[model samples]
Target: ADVPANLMEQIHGLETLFTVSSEKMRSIVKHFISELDKGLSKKGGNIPMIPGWVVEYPTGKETGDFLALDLGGTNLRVVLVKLGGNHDFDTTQNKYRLPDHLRTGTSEQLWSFIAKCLKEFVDEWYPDGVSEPLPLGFTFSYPASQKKINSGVLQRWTKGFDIEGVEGHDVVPMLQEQIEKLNIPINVVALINDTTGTLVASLYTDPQTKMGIIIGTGVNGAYYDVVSGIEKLEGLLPEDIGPDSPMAINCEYGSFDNEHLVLPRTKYDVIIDEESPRPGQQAFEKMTSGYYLGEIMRLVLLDLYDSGFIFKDQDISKLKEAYVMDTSYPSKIEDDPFENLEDTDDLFKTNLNIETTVVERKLIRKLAELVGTRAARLTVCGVSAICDKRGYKTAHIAADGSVFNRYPGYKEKAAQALKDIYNWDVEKMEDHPIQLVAAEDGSGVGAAIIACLTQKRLAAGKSVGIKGE
Candidate 1:
């Protein structure tokens, strides 16, 4: 039977939707880089314009005292760091599990909870001996815009935040309000975006630091800058202040490819984006980041169950829960596979309360490869686009988060994708010229250093008008 024009049009639409070729990725990224360059220039060269930066900490060659905290998807962390001058520091820490309801809870509740954590973070660090009020750094890692480095305006939450009232507020003030609620009496000095923290943390060890990336619960990047020539601050400055922003900037790249057509899209990718909050935004991160890789596989598994009869003998009750499965589940399946595992049968029985046959296990393992591979592969597009935006060549890019740190074989796939996309073969495992290493407490170190830098600038009369000199 001959195909009709109407049917042909539908096929064309589908064909346009599913982009599976790696070659197309190269061309797409080229365009992506161009758009990013425009964004970078719009704010100013070298300034991330993205809301991230590197923090440079000072240790009098022995140590100084500071406190740091990280607010992530599921948990909030607090650390007391003693900067042993000479690029050295010691630390004590505390962790608080954020309630599920709090994620979607009111802004007041969310901040008050964080304040409680900070209060505890301070108390835990100085228990049995009440110390002087300490200056602390806050790492606020979500989409934000800063009037300056130490302040950020919430651009609305991305990782499952439906909270009211924080979306349009300044993060630093919210954090301060929390501090007041807890009545801890400690002054919060500097606030940092997570990616900026990563960059700053890396600079503490390496001077060649150029960029900071967040690869864990989500993806974002930040870099250092001297915004002293910015023209937008004509009257925004104070009596003694000038019209240039003199601080590092965050790129907030997760929102870059919201409509980027360069990256190839799959049906699963579209489904994931459509179902997520800010459906049309963070397109690249939503697909390649840690937060969505597991969900991609979950949907694929759901499809296989319906079509392949894989879960016929198992209880489907628990499998229907949203995000009951996560990145770790897919990682576990990837790890257990000896020869393309049929499924997570053992994982199902033990973890998700299901069963799988040999063939089913093999298929399930393959499903992990599909999802994991997609995430790893697509992630390179973003990194490549960033490199293109910055005109970077053969430089070390420091990365952090569970996705970059824990995902098995993700590094190899990402490296391979970069090679494939860029046509460069810097494939010497240990000796590769460009390195992407992980850092443990990037947000903590970055937050502290940024605070230090902001205060230094303020002391020198280089602070922006937003700080209320």
Candidate 2:
């Protein structure tokens, strides 16, 4: 497939605009690791090194019937998980919707609503009523500072959460109070971060997993770090703690390099940043996340349209709106495999009610691929940084989210980025190399596993935050 001369020029321009070489990735990794280190101290640095209070990993022998309550985004999920030893589990779930008003409502209203949902699920599951308390794992996917496994103070809201009176307050106690008032006989055992839970869940079957990430509407990651290695927190822990002691650190890497100077930011990237709800925050995510990819393409296309390079100077009203196009729209164009580009053509005609010529369609396809490629490439920088810290020549990363899972060629592109970073041959990679695998319901299944792990530790008379009888 010989590249068209004019299209080649545009594609070359895109490559120059978006290419993050292996050299640059290493530099970024170094910076990422430094920030991660700084975050552990009393005087925190750039990134908030939120502690995940999980001192142990899954041993693949965890067994229990636990309840997992996930309050994330717009839905509240209550899962009854039955875990069998050696990486086996079965589950039954009930999902409840959280109204838009409640998202920004008072703390009392929100917690009471959550308690009501839990009561409903419990009533349905246990018609005969329980004789004893059921151990529960609460998967709260918001930002919180954890002192122990089962308790945390809400740091700040993300993902559209703006409920007042909750920030800077202990979230577990609030929910527990509501549950107690409702007479729900469930013992709150552990608080789970979706990212940390994903890592724990992944390790249940694949012992090789070292990290977990969420790359859906937003992007965040978590990994296990050695307590001794965290230099900034030198005198904070007990003197008996050694380098072998494992601690999970939630690396809210979505806020990576938000200054926009370290990253190769384009004009379109700048526009997205300025217009976002929190300007100059989540800079890296604005380029790659499910929420921002299509917006990037939209900004670029509008630039082309304004220059009279596309749409033939006709009524381009539809393309002018911000976010009119989403990540999936460009993905559809990229997935169109026909030589005639019939799918791409149809998308244009149906969505925007505009017709496109062959050249226009080609330009659109290349633009979509370029944005997707750049996103995939930048995503590996964080992965590489984690690998560098772990000294893992061969690693398995558990990744969850729609963009990482649904976006066409996303995983392939991510692998290619890793290959580029390490200079590994394609043949060698096939034999043994760094890998990223999909992680299943971390908030539900993974939370259940965490509850089981905590209970087992307490039974063995090991040091754990919460006790189970």
Candidate 3:
């Protein structure tokens, strides 16, 4: 299929806008390290390197029946995990869709909804009430200020959540209140970010695992850091916390380079940021996450259409809508197996109500590659930043989420970027010091492990982030 020469020129120019050079990635990594350090200081930086308060890693000997509540994005999950020790665990879970009203409603409404779900899950799982309250690990994958393992104050809602009167307030008590009112035999023992759970869960099975990352709807990472380096906790840490003591740090790298420093943002990225629910926030994520990838492609295609390049003289009103293109669209386009891109043509015809020629389909495929490839490549900067800051020559990053797990070639692209940034020998690619592996059930099994650890800390009279109960 021969595209018009003029269209070819335009497409090549568009590709330049999305391309991220290896040198640029390395430079971004350097800036990322500096921002990471700034986040640890008392005066936090754009990236809120929040202390996870998870002081212990799983020893693969944690045995118990614990519950996990994961409230992230549009779903609420209640998981019953039975850790059999020796790196063994079994889980059963039920998922409920979170209504849009609850996402923006009062805190009481949200908590009550969660409590009711928990009750329903409990009743279905255990018809006979348990002998004791089951320890619960709450995976709240949002930014929060933590004073203890069991307490977190909502920082600001992300992922389009905008409930009022919740910011700057601890959420553990809010959920706990609902549980008690319902008379559920559940105890909120630990509050964890999903990334923290991923790190701990990965370590449970693979001792070499040192970081947990999420690259799905949102992007973030977590790693263990030395206490001495966390300058913000100078007066808060207990005296027993030696300089060498390790504590998990939730690197909210989603907000990395929020100041518009090193990130190579295109005009499309700028528009996404300005129009986002939280402007000037999650800058990195706005550029390289599942939620924004399809939108970026849509914007690019819209620009092309407006210029009379592709889809000329066609009704593109449906394509003009915001977020009309789901991330899966780009995934499917990239995964098209037919030389003629029959799937891609059907996708546009069915979803957007537009027809496409072979040339247009080829252009769309190229666009998808650009958008998805940039997302994968940019993700490496955050990972490399942590390794550089910690001097981790060898580490395994346990990653979870749709983008990492389901998106075709995403992992390979990220791995290739890592190799390029580090200049790893092509022949020894398999021996690259850093590797990203599929994560265990971090929000479920990992959360349960943290709950168990918190209980152990409480029994030993160690500070688990709460004071005086």
Candidate 4:
């Protein structure tokens, strides 16, 4: 029962390609620290270290009824959150799917659709709509430029949205105009990114939570930083502002190492980048995020097939389709518990309509492990870089997304990598200073809390963005 020499050779080669050594990870973290600094400077670097207009964490005393709207992916989520203080809250939400027409339509139509959804949600929730205008927090999970807590200028659309005439314009005003037309007794108070919301929301309960990270379709992070580090806000801040003042920064680190300096790129990663819609963009994300993990596996499997290794002479027509295999496919492969890999065999027959031998099943499982482990290890570098820059010895990362939650063993792999990168004591691994924890409902409750924080700051005559605004 000896395996073929060629198949073993291919597997060895893949192991070499995907394996990132501890020394290499430490070196990457060193370079990452410098890149983060460059981003905070007046002249930005590959990573856009944008300043989020949030300066304080919740004191567990915020209480009110607030609305939160999330426009991150295919669905629009409208939530009404009631805060009862001391980390207590209640939420009622409804999800509305965004039709294809609205995703690609004019700006007016897109906002109009969202506005209509908001109106419906409000009408259903509150039959007698009176009282003063309710504060609303908007979680817009896209790249945008913000000068104030309540305004965000769209940089460009992601997540399959392509509305016209929205780029370079403040989205809050556009959303407000639509709400005004319908007389929806709601006011846009704070504009937030989901990463920022995660950080704030986690801090609401645990003060040790310093960073919020997303590992879903795409990868990004946000964290607390001192005002002095942001050189771009030299004259924009009030003279009374101290260097020790806290400010949240959205570290859009997906674009890290775009010039291909530190990251170890394989042939598969290069291919993914070249074929992507926005080539030469989000280089790190292309290699590590969920959106590309399955595609990476597909490329490797196709290569193996072309070489007459596995599924020899069979029609892989189903696999020929781009993105046909999703992240879950690999997740299932890695999660197979039986020594005979019955689940893996069944998966190929049912999902891809192909039969597989025991040897092929073993190879598929190993390939999934290699892909997933590499992604998890690389993801931890971002966390390490932030901690290193901020001089944080112990921190809790509030993480959200499918890869972190649903993908089997992803969190453990990442934690192991973090330990290796730091060279922590093996006996004390359980109490490791850095830990990744599941985040709360950031886009819902976190957004609501930020809206409340913004109102408090405004009432105290504190600047939410510019010095004299």
Candidate 5:
């Protein structure tokens, strides 16, 4: 049909200008590529001290009952796992909404509230005993730097936590001390990052679980690496390991700033970055993850009005604000899929508090699809980068979090992207992509295993060194 450039400009403005900022695009691309190198580069004889970090504890032979608390973006889940018994572990979950205060509160208030929740959870689950001390695995779903199992320094709060004291201090002590302050009787036995747990649990099943990733809330990953590979450090003991030492490394790829600017910035991204608590950081994630995808669409739609792309005669003064939507809204819009969310018209009308004609609705739906599809496809680049570095053309990657869980068509699109990137036809695998699934308490299970391993090491008369059979 020889679509005219002027017509295409009117129809698709942002996509047209998205890659024109070559500097920013290359910056992001380069950072992503670096992570791939870091991920795959740990293949030397030095056991990338990850996946193997559990040796710090007596976890492998550990058998008993332990409680795990999963504090995530939407809700708090208290679960009990009976591991190493029979066919599989047993789990029961109680869900509670995250209060507005917690979402927006200070450090003391948040931990106090968490202690109270754990106390109540314990009371309901094990009312008969208060004296028995059982190890609790705290699944802290944030970016934290770890030196050992019983410690991790909170690097920064992600998925929206802004408490101050908790960031620099050891989170294990901070959280456990908080419980003591509240008179809650519980021992936080071990601290394992959620990504580490995902990797650990996946290894428990496949023994090939080398990478643990969290794509929801905000994108981050962790894997094992030797201490020697990190050439910048000093004062490590001579016994630390050989030049090719093995150690676990937390890959904070989300902050991998290629040239310090990756997001197209298109005016909408700037508004978001400036308003975010830790602005100027996580710019890549805002372009590719759950926390900001829907908001991006909202901004674009508003720009459509402000630029007179839509609502030509109407005043957009009332729609001046940039946040009329969030990630969940687009997620909801994508879920209906009833030949176009026909069943949710009342819902969208009532919730957004704005009316729309079929044409306007068409614009919004298309905008949503574009953002979601773009996010999904771009996400594959990160994963493919990892796969390329690791020399793994195929593997069942254990994926966790809501974006992958709830998004309707995200999986297929991302699979298509992966296939396109790796040239799957040459591999003869029929274009199969990496498997992504909702994790089964990977953090909790891994944490419990780590604590168990810690206890076993202490019993076996071993200090904090690798334990081999």
Candidate 6:
């Protein structure tokens, strides 16, 4: 069977567009480290250096019953977790729908709704009203300006939240006000990010874990850093903030390496960024995160259609919408290691309502592969930047998200990127110093671990800085 000439040509062109040479990747990595330094400075780049307030990693011996409220993406998760020491825990949780109106609602309505949900959870778990206030860990995924452990001013909205009168205001007190009105005896012990919580939870189970990352709807990373090493915030910070404790920094790495042209970008990436809610923002994330992966592929296919490649003169109405093709499409296509691409054709037929020949299937598979591979490989720039900054000869990164866990070859691609930068054989293990492993239930279990760690510090009257300004 003679392959479709146009399909073969399009596949080669797509592969060339996404390819990143070892030398080019090194340049990207080098610039990523420089930008990370600027972000750490008191007055530096766009990357906000939000402190995690977790002074130390979990020792796997923490025991407690704590509540966690996670407001991220489309769902509000309320979890009651019990840590039973030695890396063991149990959870009872319920997921609540985050109404679209509430996302941009007034402060009172938003907080009032969250408060009502909390009341429902408490009523279900505790029938008696005699109990006192229970310490809680609040996982707020958006960027916040943190002045203390339990306090933070919402810097901006991410994950589709656009509530009014919330940005620049302290969220802890806002939630507390509603909780107290209901007389629900709940204490928000700390305000943390899901990425930071992921790190804490990973360390609890594996002492070797030193970094946390979320690659889902949005992308972000957290890792440990020395306070002394941050030239920008040396003595200006509070007495409680110091290098002796080795603070965890929320890299917010999704915005990483965007200011410069160091990152290799395709026309598809440019189009996506221009039309995004925050135009020209989150550039790195627009390139690598799961939210935009499928969208980018969609744009690329549209380009091919316009050029009279495959899908010539065919209706693609179903594929015109944003996010129609998800990262899972590529993951499934890549899963079929067979050259025939039977799985790829089935997927396209089912999802896009298009029938394809063998060459077209191979072309589609190639496009999906290049798109996914670019995302996987580009993510390593941030990971490598952390290793380069800390000079950590050995790093264990606990990654939580659909892309890192379920996406076929994503982890391998990330691992290979590190090997490429360090110049090591894929089979050689003696010198490989970094590893990215799956972290399950970060919002639920990780939040509990952080609450436990904060409680210990509070018990000693060490002032984990839970007070709001």
Q: Pick the candidate with the highest TM-score.
A: 4
Q: Write the per-residue lDDT of candidate 6 for residues 1-469, one digit (tens) a residue.
A: 3567766776778878998877888888888887888888755486766667788777788776788899868788999887888877888998899788877778888888888898999888887753556678888867677767778799888766767889999999999999999888787888887888888888888787878888777888888887776676565556665567677788887787666478788878888877888876788888788778778878987777777777865668887878788777888888987678888878778888877777777777777788888887888778888888888768888898878878888887888878887787558533467888777567777876788788777777675642333
Of 1 and 3, the candidate ranking higher by TM-score: 3
The Cα local distance difference test for each model comes to: 0.65, 0.79, 0.87, 0.86, 0.61, 0.79
TM-score of 3: 0.86
**TM agreement with the true structure for every prediction:** 0.72, 0.88, 0.86, 0.89, 0.71, 0.86
| Candidate 2 global Cα RMSD | 3.5
**Models sorted by TM-score, best on top:** 4, 2, 3, 6, 1, 5
Candidate 3 lDDT tens digits, 151-266:
88898989988889899889999999999999999999999988889999889878878899999997889999888898887767775556677889988788888889888999
Task: Give model 2's TM-score versus the native structure.
Answer: 0.88
- Among all windows of ten consecutive residues in candidate 6, which has the lowest summed lDDT? 460-469
Q: List the residue pairs that clash in candidate 3.
A: 148-465, 149-465
- List candidate 2 segments past 4 Å from native: 1-4, 41-43, 98-113, 123-132, 155-168, 178-183, 238-243, 426-432, 457-469
TM-score of 1: 0.72
In the range 300-363, model 4's lDDT, one tens digit per residue, is 9988888778897667998788888888888999999988789988888887888888888888
Indicate the worst ten consecutive residues by lDDT in candidate 1. Answer: 51-60
Question: Which is the better candidate, 1 or 4, if ranked by lDDT?
Answer: 4
Residues 1-469, candidate 2: write the lDDT tens digits. Answer: 3555766676678778877788987787788777666676544465776667677888877776788999867799999987787777788999998987888888999999999998998899888897777778889877676656777789898888788889989888898999999999887878978887898888887888888888888888888887777665565554334556787778777777776657778988888888888998877677668888888877887787776667774566787788888878878988999876789889878877778877778878888888888888888888888888779888888899998889988888888888988888766434437878888678988787777776765556665432231
Displacement of the residue 40 alpha carbon in candidate 6, Å = 0.2
- Residue 291: error of model 5 in Å? 2.3
Judge candidate 6 at residue 14 and give its lDDT: 82
Model 2 local distance difference test score: 0.79
Colliding pairs, model 4: none
Local accuracy of candidate 1 as per-residue lDDT tens digits, 1-469: 2344543453344345433456867776776667555564466432235533222333334245667778888878887777665555667777789998888778888888888877776666667644666667788767676665556678878888888888888877777877876778666767776676777666666655566667778777665444453344435555444323334456666665676465566676788788777788777677677887677767766765776445776787777776778888779888885653534666688877887666566556656766777677666666676666556775556777788888988787677666667666565544444456665367777676556555555557654334362
